[PDB]
Design a protein around this ligand. Structure first.
Ligand SMILES: Nc1ncnc2c1c(COc1cccc(Cl)c1)nn2C1CCOCC1
Length: 284
């Protein structure tokens, strides 16, 4: 159905607690686009304030189309989780390091603009299209939220007893504890995703859990009993240094992004990798 006067709806590509994603187009220009339908805005504030950033998708139209809330953004490519499968869920160290630099930068971008993602995972990272093909994009469906006042820059208050927000498998340890999330948390999650790409699955993954709750319970338990040095055994120390650093951050602490990025470029240099920017999936 014709929506936003100029966008034709189309096949639905994905469902989610967030709503549904449909492929669609622009009757006028004819540009493939993605559209999200939500049962009759917090995501809108994040996008229009991340606008212009590298790896931040463009929103082309916001509003209600009858009983639903619409959001149209530029079409992007596969997610890192899709590519992970395309590559037998085994990423070379180089691709992991290549991705690590970009992903740390997106997160820092969101942070420099008073927001925390809160659901950092393979699935929320999509590759660009065309010549933006090697650019990693970050997508927010609705968990992004301010962590400081745009004006004053006062960091939001500390809080406990909060229910699990974002995916359990990649959640920071304090999130599991019910602690208000902050920048440190977006980073820690990224820590687990990076280890997830090296191992192929985290040790708290696929836990025999009778019910939902017991599920988040077992994962939380397994995550807190798995020491970093055990989780990263057999891999470059940088991954241990990364996770340990994030887990050290105070609640309102400002992360040292460059230190983290450099942690991985020092490792890139020492492996002797070629600086040819090619990810595993564009190789034979
Ligand atoms: N832009 C996109 N281009 C190609 N594919 C896409 C997307 C989005 C985000 O689309 C929107 C549109 C408006 C608002 C919001 Cl949040 C998200 N998701 N997906 C896939 C859906 C199925 O599962 C994996 C990702």
């Amino acid at each position: 159905l014709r929506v936003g006067n100029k966008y034709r709806l189309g096949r639905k590509i994905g469902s989610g607690s967030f709503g549904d994603i449909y492929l669609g187009a622009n009757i006028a220009s004819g540009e493939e686009v993605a559209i999200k339908l939500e049962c009759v805005h917090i995501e809108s504030k994040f996008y229009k304030m991340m606008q212009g950033g590298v790896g931040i998708p463009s929103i082309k139209w916001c509003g209600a189309e009858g009983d639903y809330n619409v959001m149209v953004m530029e079409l992007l490519g596969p997610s890192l989780e899709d590519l992970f499968n395309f590559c037998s869920r085994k990423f070379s160290l180089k691709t992991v390091l290549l991705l690590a630099d970009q992903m740390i930068s997106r997160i820092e971008y969101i942070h420099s603009k008073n927001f925390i993602h809160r659901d950092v995972k393979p699935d929320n990272f999509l590759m660009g299209l065309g010549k933006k093909g090697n650019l990693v994009y970050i997508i927010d469906f609705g968990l992004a939220k301010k962590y400081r006042d745009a004006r004053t820059h006062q960091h939001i208050p500390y809080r406990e007893n909060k229910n699990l927000t974002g995916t359990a498998r990649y959640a920071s340890i304090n999130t599991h504890l019910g602690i208000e999330q902050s920048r440190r948390d977006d980073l820690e999650s990224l820590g687990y995703v990076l280890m997830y790409f090296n191992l192929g699955s985290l040790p708290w993954q696929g836990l025999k859990a009778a019910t939902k709750r017991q599920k988040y319970e077992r994962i939380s338990e397994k995550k807190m009993s798995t020491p970093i040095e055990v989780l990263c055994k057999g891999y470059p120390s940088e991954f241990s240094t990364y996770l340990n650093f994030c887990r050290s951050l105070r609640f309102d602490d400002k992360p040292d992004y460059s230190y983290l990025r450099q942690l991985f470029r020092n490792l890139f240099h020492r492996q002797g990798f070629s600086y040819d920017y090619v990810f595993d999936w564009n190789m034979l």
